[PDB]
Amino acid sequence: DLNDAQLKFANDVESRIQRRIEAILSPIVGNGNVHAQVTAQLDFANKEQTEEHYSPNGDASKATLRSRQLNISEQVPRSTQRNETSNYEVDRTIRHTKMNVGDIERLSVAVVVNYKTLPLPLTADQMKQIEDLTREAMGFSDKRGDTLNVVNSPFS
Amino acid sequence: DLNDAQLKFANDVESRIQRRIEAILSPIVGNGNVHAQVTAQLDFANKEQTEEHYSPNGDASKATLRSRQLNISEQVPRSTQRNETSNYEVDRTIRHTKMNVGDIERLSVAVVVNYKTLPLPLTADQMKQIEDLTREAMGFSDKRGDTLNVVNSPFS
Amino acid sequence: DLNDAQLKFANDVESRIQRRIEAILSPIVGNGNVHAQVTAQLDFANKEQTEEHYSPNGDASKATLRSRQLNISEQVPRSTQRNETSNYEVDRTIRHTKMNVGDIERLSVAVVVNYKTLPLPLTADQMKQIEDLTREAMGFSDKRGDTLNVVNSPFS
Amino acid sequence: DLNDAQLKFANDVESRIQRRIEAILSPIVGNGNVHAQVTAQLDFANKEQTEEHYSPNGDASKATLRSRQLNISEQVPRSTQRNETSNYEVDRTIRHTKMNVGDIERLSVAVVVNYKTLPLPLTADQMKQIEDLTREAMGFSDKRGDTLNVVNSPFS
């Protein structure tokens, strides 16, 4: 029963993205001269993370001391001694996070644009504008790994 | 059921932003000569953080002492001794934070502007003013990573 | 009873992918001039993972110390001694994940395209566009190992 | 009673594969000019696995230390001493998996293609296309060890 819920959730996400793309693209080319299909991958795994960090204190001008002992001796046959003990206080940061189930991982979008009749193919600048608008509509992210493909061809 | 609530919340946020953009842009170009689409990414993860910091006390003019012992000896064959023990009091700061679920992470906005009929394209200065107004309306933030694209093209 | 549920889930996934491919391809070649078949492999195993990592502290400028003892002696027959003891604080990260049952592992898709009658085979550019659109529709992933095969042949 | 369930499950899997192959192959050669038979081997054993791994720390630039003692002496008859004790923190990964009962291990498929009447045997290119489509339909995997055999012969 959970798998069916996952399928319906994915379908809802894809339908919302497709509706947004159609809404933004309709005023330019026409009401029924564009079609789009969206496929999405979703993460349904449970993840938790805990991170702990400390700041370096190797520099004497940055360390914080709590107690220190220092003994120095010298006899002049030359003899020299030096004993040192130190205790430090350190800066510590802890973060705990629990990830959300149902996030998007990757998107792939294909768009088909009808020819203009006044059978003449669209110009390159119009195709570039259409691609830019579609990229904005999909929330394109290079880090995620999304793919987009737009094809201009006459409709049957 | 939670995922549907997340979807409706995202839709509400996007609709509010779109309504604001349309409201600010309508008086300049016209009532029905502009369209906008907004897509948003939201963070639905639970995060907590604790930070602890100390101030450095390596400078003798900044340290705070609680007790100190100092023994010095000298015999004149030259002999010299020096024993020192010190205890410090330090300044400490602690901060605890719990993040809010449902914050915005990134925004992408696409706007289409109709041609002016008195078929003449709009001037560059008008496009710059429109872009500035849209940037103000979206709450543009360079740190967040928002993207905006405005296209001037005749409407079908 | 579980195996029948797995079979029906796989059939639903394949049917959804086939429907998407047919929907994207229909406007270009025609309503009834394309057929597609999809077979999918699904992972129905239960997996859990725990990962723990530490940051290196071999560099003296990156380590965080809690206490340190250092004794140095020298008599001048030349004698030299040096005793050192140190205690460190380290950065540690822990992650726990539980995988989702029912994920896709591999996809194989076969498409047949009808000849154009105005018996003339389709051009190479049209075949390339069809292949690109199908690749977008299937959510093709090279890492997963998907396979696609498109054949242009007259229909009986 | 379990063995009968295993037999019916295997029959269902084989019937689904045969139906897919017939559906993809019918539009090209004809409605009743192709037959296929599928036999499958299934794994009905219960298996569990646990894996544990550690990262190497032989490089001094990658190790993480918790405490270290180092004593050095030298008298100049030349005498030299060096005592060292070290304690490490290591990265550890644990994975636990439980396999799914009822997976496919190997497939064998035989197909017979009828002669074309306009008694003329089919061309080599058509046979290659049929083989490629069948390979896509069966989800052929070289690692699994599947076998396919297609024969073109007149029907009685």
UniProtKB/Swiss-Prot annotation, chains A, B, C, D:
<comment type="similarity">
    <text>Belongs to the FliF family.</text>
</comment>
<comment type="function">
    <text>The M ring may be actively involved in energy transduction.</text>
</comment>
<comment type="subunit">
    <text>The basal body constitutes a major portion of the flagellar organelle and consists of four rings (L,P,S, and M) mounted on a central rod. The M ring is integral to the inner membrane of the cell and may be connected to the flagellar rod via the S ring. The S (supramembrane ring) lies just distal to the M ring. The L and P rings lie in the outer membrane and the periplasmic space, respectively.</text>
</comment>
<feature type="compositionally biased region" description="Polar residues">
    <location>
        <begin position="77"/>
        <end position="88"/>
    </location>
</feature>
<protein>
    <recommendedName>
        <fullName>Flagellar M-ring protein</fullName>
    </recommendedName>
</protein>
